[PDB]
Design a protein around this ligand. Sequence first.
Ligand SMILES: Nc1ncnc2c1ncn2[C@@H]1O[C@H](COP(=O)(O)OP(=O)(O)O)[C@@H](O)[C@H]1O
Lengths: 105, 267
Amino acid sequence: MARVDQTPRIATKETGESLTINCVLRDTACALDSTNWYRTKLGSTKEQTISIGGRYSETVDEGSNSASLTIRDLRVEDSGTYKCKAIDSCWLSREGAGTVLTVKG
Amino acid sequence: RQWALEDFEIGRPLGKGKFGNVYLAREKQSKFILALKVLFKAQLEKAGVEHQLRREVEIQSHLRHPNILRLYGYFHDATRVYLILEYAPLGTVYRELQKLSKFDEQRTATYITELANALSYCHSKRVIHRDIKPENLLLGSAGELKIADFGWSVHAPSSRRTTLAGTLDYLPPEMIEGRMHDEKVDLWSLGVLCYEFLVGKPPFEANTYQETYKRISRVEFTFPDFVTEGARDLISRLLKHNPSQRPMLREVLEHPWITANSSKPSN
Ligand SMILES: Nc1ncnc2c1ncn2[C@@H]1O[C@H](COP(=O)(O)OP(=O)(O)O)[C@@H](O)[C@H]1O
């Protein structure tokens, strides 16, 4: 039953807009206190880390066992699949099912 | 967590780390030899590094490269975390440097090539390393270098106060001056390593912290006479105060001194 709900599952945005991704670790006492964010750009096969800073910001809410990623001033290059991936406080592997983002524009 | 201690035969300790020992190990069904690193959770938490290590281990789990120590998996019990690691039979570059005092140009150029190949693969995944020290480099069965410390970051660009205390010797100016830093820190690291490999000591070594700090900030280093023109050139290009003036990793890999002396190629 323990699981990560990542929302939204699908996002279509226009250039210059914003996207917020939420990941919530549910049905476990394990804490989601340190998530890393990853992206595989559309067309590519290469999974990259998302660097925090600039257009990319993140928050973590201890009380709700969640973390979020916000990307500002969206570009067409940003199109791709995003995931939260983490090792929770129980040292167990956790990952969201992903957000498929398409930017047009 | 699917792997468990009974999946492995345990042999002698390979070493003692800050938070536990590393053991020689063997997976029972495949008889594959590996290393099992034990960390005491309480010890990590008291050191305030437990959160950071979980971040670094997650990052490490994605890195598959001949010159990056492979993390096969991990598991835990109530008091310990166990990291299942690639076994590096020839020990640390640090110990090799102690044994040999310094490295010849072919060994040095080959290590630098392997490091640059690793870091190039990392940069392509938007992953950056922290300071790279010889003690955190291991040697595989054919003597191939492996970056082994999981010292990965996380944030780029960045202005966030580094533990400056510890050892300054491997930090770039922009980090000790509290300025912004990004992947260009890895090129500085390559310069310090290229120097230490050839000379036997890092270039900004001083008797006091304050002195070392000034040497780095002002980029004050000199070469022994035996260091050749080609090595001096490469090291001087890497140890630029201005991070943007440092070469690309591809330029390192293509430097005449590297191509003349390395026994390994790019990628
Ligand atoms: N994967 C490995 N293969 C072979 N020897 C290893 C491996 N990992 C560590 N060792 C040996 O054990 C020691 C373990 O300490 P290290 O991993 O450096 O611990 P720390 O967490 O303190 O950095 C190393 O100096 C090295 O000699």
